[PDB]
């Protein structure tokens, strides 16, 4: 697989071990996002319940089909460097406490809008 399961696999790490370049390199490999190297990928920290609530009362409609969180989240964005689609995949991290924009379907998060950052 469902789009919700895919979203958790790609975008949720509750208690990150770090929030730097090496953290991104290790996590992109662990979540199988390195064949080919994914260009940009954000991990959202904290609990799952707060992320699901964006699809209800803790989010607001944003543009035609997206939703913006009403409060900020701890996030780490991983951006591919070197430009080779082939692994090993090197990444640069950008961590922050930011509002996030997602898409929801059936009350569940199914896509992360990387372009918002």
Curated annotation (Swiss-Prot):
Could you mention a single GO BP entry for this protein? rRNA transcription
Q: What is this protein's function?
A: Secreted ribonuclease that can either promote or restrict cell proliferation of target cells, depending on the context. Endocytosed in target cells via its receptor PLXNB2 and translocates to the cytoplasm or nucleus. Under stress conditions, localizes to the cytoplasm and promotes the assembly of stress granules (SGs): specifically cleaves a subset of tRNAs within anticodon loops to produce tRNA-derived stress-induced fragments (tiRNAs), resulting in translation repression and inhibition of cell proliferation. tiRNas also prevent formation of apoptosome, thereby promoting cell survival.
Q: Enumerate the residues binding tRNA.
A: 19-20, 78, 100
Location(s) in or outside the cell:
Secreted; Nucleus; Nucleus, Nucleolus; Cytoplasm, Stress granule
According to its UniProt entry, this protein's organism is Mus musculus
- Keywords in UniProt for this one? Angiogenesis, Cytoplasm, Developmental protein, Differentiation, Disulfide bond, DNA-binding, Endonuclease, Hydrolase, Nuclease, Nucleus, Protein synthesis inhibitor, Pyrrolidone carboxylic acid, Secreted, Signal, Stress response
Locate the motif Nucleolar localization signal. 29-33
From the UniProt record, which GO molecular function terms apply? actin binding; copper ion binding; DNA binding; endonuclease activity; heparin binding; protein homodimerization activity; RNA binding; RNA nuclease activity
> Which cysteine pairs are covalently linked by disulfides here?
24-78, 37-89, 55-104
Tell me which family the UniProt entry assigns to this protein. Answer: Belongs to the pancreatic ribonuclease family.
Q: Identify the EC number(s).
A: 3.1.27.-
Asked whether the UniProt record includes Zinc among its keywords, one would answer no
Top-level enzyme category: hydrolase
Q: Tell me, how does this one assemble?
A: Homodimer. Interacts with RNH1; inhibiting ANG ribonuclease activity. Interacts with PCNA.
User: Record's GO cellular component, any one?
Assistant: extracellular space
The regulatory note on its activity is:
Has weak tRNA ribonuclease activity by itself due to partial autoinhibition by its C-terminus (residues 139-145), which folds into a short alpha-helix that partially occludes the substrate-binding site. In absence of stress, the ribonuclease activity is inhibited by RNH1 in the cytoplasm. In response to stress, dissociates from RNH1 in the cytoplasm and associates with cytoplasmic ribosomes with vacant A-sites: ribosomes directly activate the tRNA ribonuclease activity of ANG by refolding the C-terminal alpha-helix.
The domain of life for this entry's organism is Eukaryota
Active site residues per record: 11 (proton acceptor), 111 (proton donor)
This chain's protein is named Angiogenin
């Amino acid at each position: 697989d469902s789009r919700y399961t895919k979203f958790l696999t790609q975008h949720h790490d509750a208690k990150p071990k770090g929030r730097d370049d090496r953290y991104c390199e290790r996590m992109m490999k662990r979540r199988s996002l390195t064949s080919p190297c994914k260009d940009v990928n954000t991990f959202i920290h904290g609990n799952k319940s707060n992320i699901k609530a964006i699809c209800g009362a803790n989010g607001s409609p944003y543009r035609e089909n997206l939703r913006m969180s009403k409060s900020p989240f701890q996030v780490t964005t991983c951006k591919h460097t070197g430009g080779s689609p082939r692994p090993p995949c090197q990444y640069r991290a950008s961590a922050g406490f930011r509002h996030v924009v997602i898409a929801c379907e059936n009350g569940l998060p199914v896509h992360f809008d990387e372009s918002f950052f």
